[PDB]
Amino acid sequence: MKPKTASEHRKSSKPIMEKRRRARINESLSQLKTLILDALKKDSSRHSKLEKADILEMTVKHLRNLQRAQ
Amino acid sequence: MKPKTASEHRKSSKPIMEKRRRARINESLSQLKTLILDALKKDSSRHSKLEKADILEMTVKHLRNLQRAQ
């Protein structure tokens, strides 16, 4: 399937804290993708083809759209 | 017992494409934190220490603001 890919870049310190961080990274990215795709209402297929980079920048680009809708 | 369910990488993609994606991930996330922190002007000092999760969330939360404050 295509699960929530975790971008594991190793930078350890506190095993517990970095895991909590990691979890929260997924938590935030998941809702990020969710509210973005829902606000723009692009397509569900291009949601099922959302590359991590596509998701991140989509959020930033929507930011610009909102930021001009003042 | 020890249930080994996650040890090997069940991960499939092209090394080159995923590397290109990786670059864009970092690119997107970088400008993402930038425009968010600067738009609300929280603190640029604490901006030197933003947890990845804090960064994603900060952007999502600002999305909400943009969606409902105007």
Side-chain angles (χ1 to χ4, degrees), chain A residues 8-9 21 24-25 28-29 31-32 35-36 39 49 51-53 56-57 59-60 62-64 66-67 69-70, chain B residues 9 21-22 24-26 28-29 31-32 35-36 39 49 51-53 56-57 59-60 62-64 66-67 70:
Chain A
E8 188 180 286
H9 294 116
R21 177 190 296 152
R24 193 61 54 164
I25 298 173
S28 46
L29 210 172
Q31 62 184 270
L32 176 148
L35 283 302
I36 291 298
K49 179 56 280 188
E51 300 284 274
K52 175 158 295 176
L56 300 184
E57 181 184 91
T59 314
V60 184
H62 180 56
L63 163 62
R64 315 317 303 162
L66 294 171
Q67 282 286 28
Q70 308 299 275
Chain B
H9 300 141
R21 180 192 298 136
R22 186 180 182 180
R24 289 184 168 204
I25 295 175
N26 301 326
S28 304
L29 209 168
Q31 58 189 326
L32 174 143
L35 283 302
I36 296 301
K49 171 66 288 193
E51 298 282 288
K52 173 156 295 182
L56 306 181
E57 157 171 88
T59 312
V60 181
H62 179 54
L63 190 182
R64 314 313 298 144
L66 294 173
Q67 282 285 330
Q70 56 285 272

Side-chain angles (χ1 to χ4, degrees), chain B:
Chain B
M1 295 299 175
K2 183 60 176 178
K4 183 194 301 177
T5 305
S7 53
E8 185 55 273
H9 300 141
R10 295 207 63 172
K11 160 62 172 53
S12 306
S13 48
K14 290 262 77 181
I16 178 180
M17 296 299 297
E18 66 183 275
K19 182 278 297 186
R20 301 173 69 183
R21 180 192 298 136
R22 186 180 182 180
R24 289 184 168 204
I25 295 175
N26 301 326
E27 301 189 292
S28 304
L29 209 168
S30 187
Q31 58 189 326
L32 174 143
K33 66 177 183 180
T34 303
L35 283 302
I36 296 301
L37 204 298
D38 284 85
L40 305 80
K41 297 275 85 178
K42 289 168 167 58
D43 179 62
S44 302
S45 182
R46 65 91 54 180
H47 186 231
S48 61
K49 171 66 288 193
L50 252 89
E51 298 282 288
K52 173 156 295 182
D54 194 68
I55 301 169
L56 306 181
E57 157 171 88
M58 207 59 60
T59 312
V60 181
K61 299 194 164 300
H62 179 54
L63 190 182
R64 314 313 298 144
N65 298 335
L66 294 173
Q67 282 285 330
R68 56 77 63 178
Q70 56 285 272

Side-chain angles (χ1 to χ4, degrees), chain A residues 19-30:
Chain A
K19 192 283 289 295
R20 300 174 67 212
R21 177 190 296 152
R22 188 184 188 129
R24 193 61 54 164
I25 298 173
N26 293 275
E27 298 303 282
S28 46
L29 210 172
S30 187

